[PDB]
């Protein structure tokens, strides 16, 4: 369920990567 | 550009530092031209035995024997280059001494 | 006899509108630019428009 | 800006990798990720060279482009096949 | 040869394709190695 | 040498293991594994004589005591 | 501004591995492809825009199209004016290796390819030709003609 | 599909007409 | 690339030009007067191969005079792979 | 007193891989 | 294009001069770049051939100063493509400067 | 910006080459084509257009707006972007790619997009399976159209189509390769579909075969497109073999020789040839027609690259 | 020259494809099955390669434009490939039965494995991370194409498409280590790349870009070998696929990604940052093979999972650099080979059963006992019964990792090792003393299986009276990488 519970996780790090 | 150089050249006397096709096989021996008659004999006969089962004697032969001249060919042509250039016992240096 | 003519002004207001996609797009580039377009321009051509357009101050 | 238009390909490629391991169920979601990391390491290795300026990394995104669509050609054809008639 | 005529007839195509080919492969094979001079 | 026998086994064995019995001729051809053992020991003498080379090779590397 | 808007790309990616309905899924495929094509032609790659958009967008995802229709799941620069003067289109400067340098890494790809046509024929031949059209295979002397069931 | 595809070559073209072509 | 720029608005032109071809009919006229054919995945994959070689004829195309008669026989041998392989479709029969 | 080809052939290429190959262990 | 100002257009319709002319200076920098490309180890070769260069220029734009004019209004009107005026490259040429 | 100047005559090249069928084809079938409409028929484009905008729709159906009312203008706008790389005249050309041809035949693998697409979103499982027959033969003399391709740049340097137009000024690669323009053309023919190679277009299973909501912006959008691929297609045997813009070069003292005249004067003789060939030959039959891409087309191409590579390698020709 | 064991081999298999394929479909031979004739003539291209191959042994570096472009041929690929066509050669003979008794006409099937033994060929000098890459999808394209092969039997199908999944994704992370690695480098040539890699010292230098890559590299190459952290499907990949397709995909891409993995990690890249992943591979890999094999009831998964754990005794020898570790890797692939031909020569001999367990395995000792002690053979050689030859295998590998100081890791192979040779002979107790277990009654295996069993045998039986070719070979290896 953590690895569905990511969801939120990897998109965050997406928009943590664009911002820089 | 290229260079017939070899990694662990010349173990033997060179005759004819890369030899050009059409004497690297004029310079079969009765030796190579018994390889590449036994190598396409053992491939025209597994080529007759493997095809009586489906009918296809003829043919399989005939693909066998392709087969067979192509790697025996080659398989002489190996070795005769290997003794034309340095790399095998070459024992044809009189055909350079004499000619 | 000249009949085919009349079959043939289609093909000639369908050619009298490839002349003008053709001259178009040509007299409104030399408008835009004062040159004609360059077709082979390489990076060398765009190097020396930059120099040039730097030389002329 | 390399490292801009490589951590993309990277993230790409993470992407990838996590529909992989989460799509263990549908199979053509496998595939497209499949592809997709394939896309994410090939625009990478066009990313290098023209970083590094250097041509065997064209030459090797070439080859890659020329067997990942073979790969995706075999893998879709065995998937016609897994859903037998 | 016969079977050659029945294949240059019955598959034009496919025998005027490996002789439109043929002037591809053999005018480097051997008519380049001819123009030495 | 050896290989004969070894040759009569494994035609032997191959004819235990299809269920025909221990006949034939093909263990005639075992002399051919004769030739095989004489082969493999040729190769055996060969082998160790280029690896004594290669070790040759390696004593000179590895900084040569330095 | 459109050097940043690999996002498109980026998210895209995104939605093929978090979708359930399979349109999608291979339209963000699509998506993907054409975002990095636009990225390849940042880069000045021109060639290999080109060969994404061809055998990734007409054939490759044409393929999972396919797979979806049917099959449904449910300043300072310093120019040197030298290496200027020939500019080699990126076709030109490919072809001066693969070919003649590296070709035995382009006559493998020939041998995949290869592969890949003998594979796509051996798997979905489907029984449709000579892999099983050549008979039923039902013989007369081999029969007994039912009247000993 | 088996199914007997149309095989385009035949014999060639010779005009047939019927026996009473000048005695009937 | 300098030459993509016309292309890229030119996308986004035609798509305008397209939407107005869109938009004018709807404006006007207003109240009053087989489970699967295989053979489409076999034709699919075997563009899919002819197009990969044909991506790889485009640079020894444009690139001939460079890899003089060793490049040429270089994408022979590529060549005569690919009719080996279009000679086991066309046998086998793929091409139907 | 004849036999058909295609086998006679097989029989001649049999008799030159055992007299090639006797050749051959012979050099 | 006026003062002989070394643009594109009056630099790439003097090459053939600027090639039988001025070619010690030109081969002596390609020396020197060949030797090491660091800018300044050959500033005063840099000089050198912009020396003699813009002198052959303002040669070529005084003895054929029409002629000189019209082809560089060739080579400004066409990008520096040689084929698409080869009357004016000729009537320049034939003039004075062979 | 200039993409009017390129995408309206364009239009209006369409609009008049529907008339320009009708007309030759039926000239050819003695008979006047469209004759009371315009003062020759000039008229009867505007008149079709006119028609089929003001007819009302069978159902509204705006709902479904995103998935098959933009598929046309798909179609529709790869059949025009592909105008682009292609020069009607020296410094013509609207955006010269150093890599026209390639571009070239990218957007043919995007117009299968087109075709597939709005063939799919038709919920009609004989148009569907029509529409992928038609992408299927679309993209399988696509691969015969790119080995021809091949051969007309082997014979040019690059794939820079003004260089593909500018490398036949000593001889149009008509001539040498003769053989191989009646493969781009028979190609050309059967890429796009009108052809003597139309069975999906066999006068009824067309109209049934593309679309199930029509509301007459469809059926005229893909005519349309038909008719500007095939205006493009026929504007690409006039770059690669036929002099894309060059005279004969015999430098007339009538002629002042304009080159877009000369592009125009080709792009007609390959579009009369589309119609006269519509015209005189039967349908193909879409089971022989893709027996004629693979077993006939690909061979004869296939030669002809090895054929055009020889002969430009042996003698130093490249 | 240089490539007359490759040239050879394509043109073979284009003479076969397209003798092939115009008898199949051919109406005048009644569409006749190609297998069987276009095998026997494959496997003859195998030894006449095989010969083409030994014989220029010298030759083989006769050129240098293959050198510092393409591949570098030397003493270890020369070896090694001799093996790889041997070890082709055993599998093509084993599948003669599941040719002509299982209905086979697809002979392309020999064709591709005839490309992918090409492939392989191409692996082994593979000197070039674009050529390694090259030469490994082209091998696992063709295993991908022929375990997906049986279109009838669904449970083959499934299998092959995970088989081809796990391998793309494999792939996809051995390529993106050769991103990282080149792009952090701009150099693909392992000539190239040892010269860069020397004194790297990823834990002790900050190169984050060339760690990833070798990590990424290890991991696909890991997934290729199928060890124990990322298997992931490899019991399920030699279960589904037919036996014969198995019997290929699980000796022949182990010894062929084996002698890649000595190219690059042993030259390539040299240093201890990187095999340690390879010590957790192998700790863990000899831990799941023992376990799983103490679990496992399907044969066929049963040598799946005994395959695993013998890759992981294999990497051992890697997860030490030194000369004795690496010629203990090369021993142990040799040991593992030829008896995993012989148990797949086995398993291939009861064509019989369907998907059957160990169990339906019985009675084996009263049915064709002399097939029952050939199997007892081979399964004590896996678990490294002093008498035999796997155990000269674990033991060399033991003894190169005590000698390499990693005392822990000669402790859990021992601890593993014991724990096998207890589950083995548990098994052959169970298959012999007792348990009759419904008596299934098998044809007879063919001569081919029966010379490969028989020889093979003899090997590993007599294995220790004369391990002085075999020491001397890997050695001559270990020394030329
Ligand atoms: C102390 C006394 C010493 C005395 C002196 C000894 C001197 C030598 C002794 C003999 C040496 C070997 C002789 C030749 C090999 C024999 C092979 C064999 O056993 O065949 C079994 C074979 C079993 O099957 P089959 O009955 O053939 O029916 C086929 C099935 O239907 C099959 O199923 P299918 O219907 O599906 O068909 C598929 C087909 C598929 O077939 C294939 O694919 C076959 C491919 C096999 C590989 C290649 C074989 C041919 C070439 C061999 C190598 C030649 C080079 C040298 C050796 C290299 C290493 C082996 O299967 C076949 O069976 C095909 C034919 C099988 C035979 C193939 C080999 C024979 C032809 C070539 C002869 C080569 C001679 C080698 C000599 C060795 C020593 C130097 O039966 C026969 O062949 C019987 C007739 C032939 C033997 C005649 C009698 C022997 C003659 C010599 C005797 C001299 C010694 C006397 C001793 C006296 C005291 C005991
Ligand atoms: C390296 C790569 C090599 C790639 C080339 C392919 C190599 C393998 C070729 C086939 C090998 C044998 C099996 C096929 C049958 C056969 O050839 O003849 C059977 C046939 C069996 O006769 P038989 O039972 O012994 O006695 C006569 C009786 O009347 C009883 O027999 P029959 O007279 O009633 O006839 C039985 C029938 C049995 O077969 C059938 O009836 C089945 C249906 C046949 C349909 C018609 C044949 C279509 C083949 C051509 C396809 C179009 C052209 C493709 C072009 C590709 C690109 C260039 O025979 C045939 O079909 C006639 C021969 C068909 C050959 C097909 C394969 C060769 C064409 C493909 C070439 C590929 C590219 C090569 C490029 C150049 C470099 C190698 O042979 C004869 O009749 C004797 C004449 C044989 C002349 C010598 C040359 C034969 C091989 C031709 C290719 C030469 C190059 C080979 C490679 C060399 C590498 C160094
Ligand atoms: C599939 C694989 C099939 C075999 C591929 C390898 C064959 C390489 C043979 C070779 O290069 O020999 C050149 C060599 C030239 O003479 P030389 O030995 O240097 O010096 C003595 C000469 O009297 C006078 O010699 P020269 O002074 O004229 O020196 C040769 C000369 C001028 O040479 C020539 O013009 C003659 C070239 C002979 C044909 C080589 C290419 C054709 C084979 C591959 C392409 C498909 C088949 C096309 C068949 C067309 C008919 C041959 O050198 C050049 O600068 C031009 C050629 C450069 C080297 C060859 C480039 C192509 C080969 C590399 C790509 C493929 C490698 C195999 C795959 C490796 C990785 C898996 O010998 C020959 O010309 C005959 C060689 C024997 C036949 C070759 C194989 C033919 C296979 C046909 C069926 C294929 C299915
Ligand atoms: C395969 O077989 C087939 C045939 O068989 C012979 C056919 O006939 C055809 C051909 C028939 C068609 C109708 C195809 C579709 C073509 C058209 C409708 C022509 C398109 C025309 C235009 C682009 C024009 C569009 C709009 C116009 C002209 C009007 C816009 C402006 C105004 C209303 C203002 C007008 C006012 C004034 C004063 C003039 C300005 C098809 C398709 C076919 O499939
Ligand atoms: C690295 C190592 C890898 C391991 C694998 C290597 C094997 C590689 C290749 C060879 C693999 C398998 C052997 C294949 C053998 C082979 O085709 O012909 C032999 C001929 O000869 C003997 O039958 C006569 C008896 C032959 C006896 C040979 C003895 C050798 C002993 C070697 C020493 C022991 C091992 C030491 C280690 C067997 O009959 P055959 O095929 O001729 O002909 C027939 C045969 O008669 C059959 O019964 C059938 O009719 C038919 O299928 C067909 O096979
Ligand atoms: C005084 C007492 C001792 C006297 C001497 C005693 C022993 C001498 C030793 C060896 C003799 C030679 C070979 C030993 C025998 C090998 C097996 C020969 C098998 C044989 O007949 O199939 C020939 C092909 O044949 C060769 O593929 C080629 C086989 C060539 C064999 C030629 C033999 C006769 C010529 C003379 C020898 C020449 C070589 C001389 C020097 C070397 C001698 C060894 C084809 O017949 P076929 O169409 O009916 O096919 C057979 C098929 O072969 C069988 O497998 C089937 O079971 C059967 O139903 C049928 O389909």
């Given at each position: 369920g953590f690895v569905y519970h990511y969801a939120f996780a990897m998109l965050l790090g997406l928009t943590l990567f664009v911002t820089f | 550009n290229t260079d017939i150089t070899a990694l662990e050249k010349a173990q033997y006397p060179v005759v004819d530092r890369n030899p050009a096709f059409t004497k690297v096989v004029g310079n079969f021996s009765t030796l190579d031209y018994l390889r590449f008659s036994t190598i396409t004999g053992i491939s025209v006969t597994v080529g007759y035995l493997s095809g009586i089962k489906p009918g296809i004697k003829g043919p399989s032969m005939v693909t066998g024997g392709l087969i067979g001249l192509m790697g025996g060919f080659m398989y002489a042509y190996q070795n005769s280059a290997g003794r034309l250039m340095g790399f095998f016992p070459n024992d044809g240096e009189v055909a350079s001494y004499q000619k | 006899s000249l009949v085919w003519l009349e079959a043939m002004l289609p093909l000639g207001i369908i050619g009298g509108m490839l002349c003008i996609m053709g001259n178009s797009q040509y007299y409104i580039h030399k408008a835009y630019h004062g040159r004609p377009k360059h077709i082979g321009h390489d990076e060398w051509d765009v190097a020396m428009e930059r120099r040039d357009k730097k030389v002329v101050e | 800006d390399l490292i801009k238009y490589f951590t993309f390909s990277m993230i790409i490629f993470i992407l990838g990798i996590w529909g992989i391991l989460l799509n263990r169920r549908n199979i053509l979601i496998m595939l497209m990720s499949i592809e997709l990391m394939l896309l994410a390491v090939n625009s990478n290795f066009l990313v290098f060279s023209v970083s590094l300026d250097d041509m065997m990394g064209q030459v090797f995104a070439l080859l890659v482009l020329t067997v990942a669509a073979a790969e995706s050609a075999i893998g879709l054809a065995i998937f016609v096949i897994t859903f037998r008639v | 040869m016969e079977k050659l005529r029945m294949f240059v007839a019955q598959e034009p195509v496919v025998a005027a394709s490996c002789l439109i080919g043929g002037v591809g492969l053999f005018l480097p094979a051997v008519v380049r190695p001819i123009l030495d001079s | 040498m050896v290989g004969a026998l070894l040759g009569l086994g494994t035609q032997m064995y191959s004819n235990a293991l299809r269920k025909l019995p221990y006949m034939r001729h093909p263990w005639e051809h075992v002399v051919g594994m004769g030739l095989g053992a004489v082969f493999a020991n040729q190769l055996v003498k060969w082998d160790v004589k280029l690896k004594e080379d290669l070790d040759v090779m390696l004593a000179k590397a590895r900084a040569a005591n330095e | 501004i459109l050097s940043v808007l690999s996002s498109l790309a980026l998210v895209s990616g995104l939605m093929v591995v978090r979708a359930k309905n399979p349109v999608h899924s291979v339209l963000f495929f699509i998506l993907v492809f054409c975002d990095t094509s636009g990225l390849l032609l940042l880069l000045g790659l021109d060639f290999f825009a080109m060969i994404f958009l061809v055998v990734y967008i007409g054939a490759i995802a044409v393929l999972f199209l396919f797979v979806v229709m049917m099959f449904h799941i449910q300043s300072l620069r310093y120019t040197v004016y030298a290496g200027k003067v020939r500019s080699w289109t990126n076709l030109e400067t490919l072809g001066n290796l693969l070919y003649t340098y590296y070709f035995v890494w382009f006559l493998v790809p020939s041998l995949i390819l290869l592969v890949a046509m003998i594979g796509a024929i051996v798997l979905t031949m489907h029984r449709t030709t000579k892999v099983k059209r050549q008979d039923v295979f039902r013989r007369n002397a081999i029969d007994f003609r039912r009247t000993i069931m | 599909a088996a199914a007997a595809a149309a095989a385009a070559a035949a014999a060639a073209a010779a005009a047939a007409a019927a026996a009473a072509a000048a005695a009937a | 690339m300098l030459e993509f720029a016309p292309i890229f608005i030119y996308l986004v032109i035609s798509l305008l030009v397209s939407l107005i071809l869109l938009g004018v009919p709807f404006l006007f006229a207003s109240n009053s007067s087989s489970r699967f054919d295989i053979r489409f995945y076999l034709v699919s994959i075997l563009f899919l191969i002819f197009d990969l070689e044909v991506t790889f004829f485009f640079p020894w195309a444009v690139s001939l005079n460079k890899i003089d008669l060793f490049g040429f026989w270089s994408m022979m041998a590529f060549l005569f792979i690919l009719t080996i392989g279009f000679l086991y479709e066309w046998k086998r029969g793929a091409l139907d | 007193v004849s036999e058909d080809k295609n086998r006679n052939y097989a029989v001649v290429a049999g008799v030159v891989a055992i007299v090639g190959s006797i050749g051959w262990y012979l050099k | 294009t006026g003062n002989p100002i070394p643009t594109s257009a009056v630099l790439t319709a003097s090459a053939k001069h600027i090639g039988m002319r001025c070619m010690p200076e030109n081969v002596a920098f390609l020396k020197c770049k060949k030797n090491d490309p660091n800018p300044e180890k050959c500033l005063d070769k840099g000089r050198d051939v912009t020396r003699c260069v813009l002198g052959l220029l303002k040669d070529l734009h005084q003895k054929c100063q029409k002629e000189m004019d019209d082809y560089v209004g060739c080579m400004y009107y066409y990008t520096n493509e040689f084929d698409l005026c080869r009357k004016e490259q000729e009537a320049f040429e034939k003039v004075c400067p062979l | 910006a200039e993409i009017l100047g390129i995408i309206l005559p364009l239009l209006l090249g369409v609009a008049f080459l529907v008339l320009a069928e009708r007309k030759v084809m039926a000239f050819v079938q003695r008979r006047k084509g469209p004759d009371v409409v315009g003062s020759f028929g000039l008229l009867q484009p505007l008149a079709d257009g006119l028609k089929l905008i003001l007819k009302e729709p069978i159902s509204p159906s705006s709902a479904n707006f995103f998935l098959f009312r933009m598929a046309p203008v798909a179609t529709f706008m790869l059949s025009l972007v592909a105008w682009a790389v292609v020069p009607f005249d020296y410094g013509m050309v609207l955006s010269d790619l150093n890599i026209g041809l390639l571009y070239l035949f990218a957007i043919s693998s995007l117009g299968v997009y087109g075709i597939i697409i709005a063939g799919w979103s038709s919920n009609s499982k004989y148009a569907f399976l029509g529409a992928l027959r038609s992408a299927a033969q679309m993209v399988s003399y696509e691969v015969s159209i790119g080995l021809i391709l091949i051969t007309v740049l082997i014979c040019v340097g690059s794939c820079n189509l003004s260089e593909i137009v500018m490398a036949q000024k000593q001889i149009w690669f008509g001539i040498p390769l003769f053989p191989v323009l009646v493969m781009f053309f028979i190609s050309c023919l059967a890429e796009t579909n009108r052809a003597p190679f139309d069975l999906p277009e066999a006068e009824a299973e067309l109209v049934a075969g593309y679309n199930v909501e029509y509301s007459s912006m469809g059926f005229a959008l893909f005519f349309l497109g038909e008719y500007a691929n095939m205006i493009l297609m026929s504007g690409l045997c006039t770059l690669f073999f036929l002099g894309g813009w060059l005279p004969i070069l015999d430098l007339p003292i009538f002629k002042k020789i304009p080159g877009s005249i000369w592009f125009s004067i080709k792009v007609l003789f390959f579009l009369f040839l589309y119609i006269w060939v519509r015209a005189a030959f039967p349908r193909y039959r879409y089971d022989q027609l893709m027996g004629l891409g693979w077993k006939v087309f690909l061979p004869l191409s296939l030669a002809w690259v090895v054929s055009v590579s020889g002969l430009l390698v042996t003698f130093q020709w490249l | 020259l240089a490539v007359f064991p490759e040239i050879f081999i394509i043109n073979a298999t284009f003479i076969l494809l397209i003798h092939g394929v115009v008898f199949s479909t051919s109406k005048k031979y009644d569409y006749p099955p190609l297998a069987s004739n276009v095998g026997w003539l494959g496997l003859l291209s195998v030894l006449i390669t095989l010969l083409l191959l030994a014989a220029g042994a010298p030759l083989l570096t006769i050129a240098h434009l293959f050198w510092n472009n393409l591949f570098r041929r030397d003493n270890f690929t020369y070896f090694c490939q001799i093996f790889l066509l041997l070890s082709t050669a055993g599998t093509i003979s084993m599948c003669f039965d599941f040719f002509d008794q299982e209905?086979?006409?697809?002979?392309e099937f020999i064709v591709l494995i005839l490309l992918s033994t090409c492939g392989m060929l191409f692996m082994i000098s593979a000197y070039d991370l674009i050529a390694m890459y090259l030469a490994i999808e082209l091998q696992s394209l063709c295993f991908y194409v022929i375990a997906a092969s049986k279109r009838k039997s669904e449970f083959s199908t499934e299998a092959g498409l995970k088989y081809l999944i796990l391998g793309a994704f494999s792939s996809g992370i051995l390529l993106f280590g050769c991103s990282m690695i080149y792009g952090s480098t701009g150099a693909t040539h392992f000539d190239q790349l040892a010269k860069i890699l020397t004194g790297y010292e990823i834990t002790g230098a900050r190169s984050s870009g060339i760690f990833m890559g070798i990590l990424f590299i290890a991991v696909g190459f890991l997934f290729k070998i199928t060890?124990?952290?990322?298997?992931?499907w490899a019991p399920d990949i030699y279960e589904g696929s037919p036996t014969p397709v198995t019997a290929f995909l699980s000796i022949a891409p182990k010894i062929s990604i084996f002698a890649n993995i000595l190219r690059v990690f042993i030259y390539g890249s040299y240093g201890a940052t990187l095999q340690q992943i390879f010590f957790f591979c192998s700790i863990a890999s000899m831990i799941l093979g023992a376990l799983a094999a103490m679990a496992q009831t399907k044969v066929k998964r049963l040598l799946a999972y005994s395959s695993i754990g013998h890759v992981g005794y294999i990497c051992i020898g890697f997860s030490c650099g030194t000369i004795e570790g690496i010629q203990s890797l090369l021993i142990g692939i040799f040991i593992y080979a030829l008896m995993t031909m012989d148990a797949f020569a086995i398993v291939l001999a009861?064509?019989?059963?369907?998907?059957?367990?160990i169990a339906d395995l019985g009675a084996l000792a009263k049915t064709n006992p002399i097939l029952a002690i050939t199997f007892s053979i081979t399964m004590f050689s896996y678990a490294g019964i002093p008498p035999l030859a796997g155990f000269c295998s674990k033991f060399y590998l033991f003894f190169a990792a005590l000698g390499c100081g990693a005392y822990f890791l000669a402790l859990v192979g021992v601890v593993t090792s014991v724990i096998g040779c207890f589950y083995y002979i548990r098994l052959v107790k169970r298959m012999?003393?007792?348990?009759?277990?419904?008596?299934i009654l098998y044809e007879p295996m063919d001569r081919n299986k029966s010379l490969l069993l028989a020889m093979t045998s003899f090997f590993i039986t007599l294995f220790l009276l004369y391990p002085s070719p075999l020491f001397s070979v890997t050695h001559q290896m270990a020394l030329s990488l």
């Open positions: - | - | - | - | - | - | - | - | - | - | - | - | 209905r086979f006409d697809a002979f060890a124990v952290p990322f298997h992931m009861l064509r019989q059963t369907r998907v059957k367990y012999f003393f007792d348990t009759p277990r419904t008596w």
